[PDB]
Amino acid sequence: SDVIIGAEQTKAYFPILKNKRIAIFSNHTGMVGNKHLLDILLENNFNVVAIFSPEHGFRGNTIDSKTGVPILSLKPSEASMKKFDILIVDIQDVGLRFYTYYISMVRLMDACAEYDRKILILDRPNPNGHYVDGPILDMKYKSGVGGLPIPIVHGMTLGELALMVNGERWLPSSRICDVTVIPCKNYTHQTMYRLPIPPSPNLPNMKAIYLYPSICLFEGTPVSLGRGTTLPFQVYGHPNMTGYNYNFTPRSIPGAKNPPQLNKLCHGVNLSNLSDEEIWKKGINLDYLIDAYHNLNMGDRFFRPFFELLVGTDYVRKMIEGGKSADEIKARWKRDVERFKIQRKPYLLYQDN
Ligand SMILES: [Cl-]
Known part of the structure; x- marks a missing residue:
């Protein structure tokens, strides 16, 4: 129960x-x-x-x-x-x-x-x-x-x-x-577990919460992730992105008053219809970040200085810019994750996964 x-x-x-x-x-x-x-x-x-x-x-x-x-x-x-x-x-x-x-x-x-x-x-x-x-x-x-x-x-x-x-x-x-x-x-x-009450205004639903690990990386870039829209953390796009079948325009709304790309037509991708299951399968998914990086063609200026503060290591930027794949980059942290699962084990209060 x-x-x-x-x-x-x-x-x-x-x-x-x-x-x-x-x-x-x-x-x-x-x-x-x-x-x-x-x-x-x-x-x-x-x-x-x-x-x-x-x-x-x-x-x-x-x-x-x-x-x-x-x-x-x-x-x-x-x-x-x-x-x-x-x-x-x-x-x-x-x-x-x-x-x-x-x-x-x-x-x-x-x-x-x-x-x-x-x-x-x-x-x-x-x-x-x-x-x-x-x-x-x-x-x-x-x-x-x-x-x-x-x-x-x-x-x-x-x-x-x-x-x-x-x-x-x-x-x-x-x-x-x-x-x-x-x-x-x-x-x-x-x-x-599904949250009855939104924990932050722009995490309004479980889709946003499940996508958050992947999509919040865009806060280290100029790409909008949907603040100012009906689909925060469930889309990504930018006025300069080119060749896309979805668009949105961030608006000045309560709790997203001065959002990224305010009042600009952003071109990009709607992720809001992904099933919860397919989000769970992929975990942190660098596909989106890599897509936007290569589409925008602004090289290293795509990554804010503080991208590293979000991702936590220097190799993600370098590998993206080097043309590496999402899977290659993600595999690089597998060992870190293995080791952390060992390190945390004495502190768990519930059955591990
Ligand atoms: Cl918020």
């Missing part, structure tokens, strides 16, 4: 929270029915004293007006750390190295470690938890879009990843944080 997320398992963690001053790291996805975890805890007479959000606050658009709890955008101040005993993580991730909630989580783990506070992670599925793919990030390229030496698609839940951050000593000053994970039930690393 169906996945039971950590936050649903109140008999597992309500006793942990009893009599404690509680902070929560979450956003609008941290819901069980039409209540935020914050609301459920307050209704059960728990003392929630603060919420940390990677956006403004968790109501999807510095004090929550429904509850009066202070709301803190994301390290935390010393003053804030003193206010609570336990921090709860409850947030829906998408499983990519360049999707940044885990970097916020690592920041909070470091702070909690320094201040001797416990973290409780109410685990949620990784919708891309069914595979591991891409180069391990070279730490020459550590950045705002890549915080740990992990593959592009790491395959782990935030709870698993937290355990790995501790065990591999990936926090600053090599601290470990006291972490308890409430694991999901009815969940393996083959389960294909």
Whole structure:
């Protein structure tokens, strides 16, 4: 039967929270029915004293007006750390190295470690938890879009990843944080969990989430990936691309106000009718990037300087420019992926794939 997320398992963690001053790291996805975890805890007479959000606050658009709890955008101040005993993580991730909630989580783990506070992670599925793919990030390229030496698609839940951050000593000053994970039930690393609530505005559906590992690489290029359209992360195109049977024009819309190629007719490819199965078969698929590179004929200027910060190694640009195939390039990282699957194994909380 169906996945039971950590936050649903109140008999597992309500006793942990009893009599404690509680902070929560979450956003609008941290819901069980039409209540935020914050609301459920307050209704059960728990003392929630603060919420940390990677956006403004968790109501999807510095004090929550429904509850009066202070709301803190994301390290935390010393003053804030003193206010609570336990921090709860409850947030829906998408499983990519360049999707940044885990970097916020690592920041909070470091702070909690320094201040001797416990973290409780109410685990949620990784919708891309069914595979591991891409180069391990070279730490020459550590950045705002890549915080740990992990593959592009790491395959782990935030709870698993937290355990790995501790065990591999990936926090600053090599601290470990006291972490308890409430694991999901009815969940393996083959389960294909579908997100009820969009995790970001331009990841509106599962097609976008499944294509994201391949298509977000275009953020290291001038190519539009459909922000400003009905099909974000499900198309690619550019005004200069030539010879294509699909076109779109990005528009200035809420959450995509000043999108790439705004008000330009972009020529390209519609991927929105690929089956979920055929996306799963291919994992990170460099076909799209290679197609656009060769079509545009602008040589190395196709790749933004920070392409490497997204892909995590220097050889992808070089091999594309050298005329190598998608399969050749992808094969180069197979060993990295093999090794990471071994490295992560002690930290998995669910059946491996
Ligand atoms: Cl977005």
